[PDB]
Write a protein that holds these residues in place. Structure first.
Motif, mmCIF file in Angstrom:
data_model
loop_
_atom_site.group_PDB
_atom_site.id
_atom_site.type_symbol
_atom_site.label_atom_id
_atom_site.label_comp_id
_atom_site.label_asym_id
_atom_site.label_seq_id
_atom_site.Cartn_x
_atom_site.Cartn_y
_atom_site.Cartn_z
ATOM 1 N N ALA A 1 0.823 -1.206 0.000
ATOM 2 C CA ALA A 1 0.000 0.000 0.000
ATOM 3 C C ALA A 1 0.859 1.258 0.000
ATOM 4 O O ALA A 1 0.539 2.235 -0.683
ATOM 5 N N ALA A 2 1.948 1.256 0.763
ATOM 6 C CA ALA A 2 2.840 2.405 0.788
ATOM 7 C C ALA A 2 3.500 2.621 -0.563
ATOM 8 O O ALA A 2 3.644 3.762 -1.017
ATOM 9 N N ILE B 1 -1.418 -1.740 10.960
ATOM 10 C CA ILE B 1 -2.822 -1.399 11.147
ATOM 11 C C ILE B 1 -2.997 0.109 11.228
ATOM 12 O O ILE B 1 -3.636 0.718 10.362
ATOM 13 N N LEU B 2 -2.375 0.741 12.221
ATOM 14 C CA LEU B 2 -2.571 2.155 12.506
ATOM 15 C C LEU B 2 -2.096 3.080 11.397
ATOM 16 O O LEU B 2 -2.455 4.259 11.416
ATOM 17 N N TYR B 3 -1.290 2.607 10.451
ATOM 18 C CA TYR B 3 -0.759 3.494 9.427
ATOM 19 C C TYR B 3 -1.091 3.101 7.998
ATOM 20 O O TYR B 3 -0.899 3.933 7.108
ATOM 21 N N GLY C 1 -8.809 4.271 2.447
ATOM 22 C CA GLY C 1 -8.080 4.411 1.203
ATOM 23 C C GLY C 1 -7.056 3.317 0.999
ATOM 24 O O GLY C 1 -6.904 2.794 -0.108
ATOM 25 N N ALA C 2 -6.331 2.971 2.064
ATOM 26 C CA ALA C 2 -5.336 1.910 1.976
ATOM 27 C C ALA C 2 -5.975 0.529 2.007
ATOM 28 O O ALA C 2 -5.474 -0.398 1.357
ATOM 29 N N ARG C 3 -7.077 0.371 2.745
ATOM 30 C CA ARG C 3 -7.857 -0.855 2.625
ATOM 31 C C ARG C 3 -8.410 -1.017 1.220
ATOM 32 O O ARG C 3 -8.578 -2.144 0.749
ATOM 33 N N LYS D 1 -8.331 -4.082 -3.740
ATOM 34 C CA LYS D 1 -8.153 -4.114 -5.185
ATOM 35 C C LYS D 1 -6.927 -4.913 -5.605
ATOM 36 O O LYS D 1 -6.836 -5.310 -6.771
ATOM 37 N N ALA D 2 -5.988 -5.159 -4.693
ATOM 38 C CA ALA D 2 -4.812 -5.950 -5.031
ATOM 39 C C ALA D 2 -4.957 -7.422 -4.676
ATOM 40 O O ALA D 2 -4.515 -8.278 -5.446
ATOM 41 N N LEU D 3 -5.553 -7.746 -3.527
ATOM 42 C CA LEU D 3 -5.845 -9.145 -3.238
ATOM 43 C C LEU D 3 -6.875 -9.723 -4.194
ATOM 44 O O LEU D 3 -6.960 -10.950 -4.317
ATOM 45 N N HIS D 4 -7.653 -8.874 -4.867
ATOM 46 C CA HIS D 4 -8.583 -9.324 -5.891
ATOM 47 C C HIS D 4 -7.895 -9.619 -7.215
ATOM 48 O O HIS D 4 -8.550 -10.121 -8.136
ATOM 49 N N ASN D 5 -6.603 -9.311 -7.339
ATOM 50 C CA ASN D 5 -5.845 -9.739 -8.508
ATOM 51 C C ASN D 5 -5.551 -11.233 -8.467
ATOM 52 O O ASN D 5 -5.373 -11.857 -9.519
#
Length: 294
Positions: free
Chosen positions: A31-32, A274-276, A282-284, A289-293
């Protein structure tokens, strides 16, 4: 100078850390990186924090053994000097990148129309490089010392002596005071300034203000709850040594609590992802959208 029955808590806690903080930190690193692609220079610090957390959690499988087997290190002196330096750092790298994030946020929110040169991916990368260079060179003292020490009661130590060396006490003082309280104080001041700025906002709807306050308080409460007991007790057993260098009355009693607190300070590696990068939608969204790849 002796030890206690401390062989279950740190192992059972590092197992949980291994189980949770490898997938969460890989997701947070992804995500980062996703953020950096959009020229969000907060993503640079989030990646660096995720990297420090990752190469911390990838050197726990050794200390889980070092604690399962009662207080003995057996993988040579080479492993005890590298995996003992990674393990007694990345704490002061994590709490340096958390401070970098809080200062980055303070500048953006409290001065939204200024210091635009300071909020760039290039300057973020340079600041990250300086952060890695320091606290890895300035905390490098244990390397230039023999640090696989035996004793009477079958305790093969790693980065310790209960009869403390002259430098170890001073380096512990430096740890407590210029690796925890200073970056933590800057984090607290930055989030206080962020809340003072958010208070004046006209376009924020006063439940968003409550959400911002309850996230900003938890950011500086998790760090304290994870680092304060270990560092306070490190201060304790380093301040006693200066008073009575040739003594072991305190150390034997406080040994088990000291090592349990050192086990505790590892929760600020599943706390960070978790906290960041997993508490905001937005990061979830990136995670989904990436684990759905696959």
């Amino acid at each position: 100078v002796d030890s206690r029955v401390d062989h279950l808590f740190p192992p059972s806690l590092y197992i949980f850390v291994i189980g949770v903080g490898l997938p969460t930190n890989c997701l947070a690193l992804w995500a980062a990186y996703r953020q950096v692609r959009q020229h969000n220079e907060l993503g640079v610090y989030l990646m660096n924090l995720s990297i420090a957390d990752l190469l911390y959690i990838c050197t726990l499988p050794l200390w889980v053994d070092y604690f399962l087997h009662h207080d003995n290190w057996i993988h040579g002196p080479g492993s005890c000097k590298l995996f003992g330096f990674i393990f007694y750092s990345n704490i002061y790298i994590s709490i340096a990148f958390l401070c970098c994030i809080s200062v980055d946020r303070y500048l953006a929110v409290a001065h939204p129309l200024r210091f635009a040169r300071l909020r760039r991916v290039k300057t973020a990368v340079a600041v990250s490089s300086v952060v890695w260079a320091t606290e890895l060179g300035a905390n490098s003292a244990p390397l230039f010392h023999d640090e696989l020490f035996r004793d009477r009661y079958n305790h093969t130590f790693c980065f310790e002596k209960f009869p403390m060396e002259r430098w170890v006490a001073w380096m512990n003082l430096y740890r407590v005071f210029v690796g925890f309280l200073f970056p933590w104080a800057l984090m607290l001041l930055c989030y206080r300034g962020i809340l003072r700025a958010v208070q004046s906002s006209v376009s924020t709807e006063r439940q968003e203000k409550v959400k911002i306050k309850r996230l900003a308080l938890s950011l500086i409460a998790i760090v304290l709850v994870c680092f304060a007991p270990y560092h306070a007790l490190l201060l304790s057993r380093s301040a006693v040594y200066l008073g009575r260098p040739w003594d072991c009355g305190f150390e034997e009693r406080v040994f088990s609590a000291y090592h349990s607190s050192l086990a505790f300070t590892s929760l600020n590696c599943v706390a960070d992802p978790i906290l960041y990068c997993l508490v905001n939608e937005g990061a979830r969204s990136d995670v989904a959208k990436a684990l759905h790849n696959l």
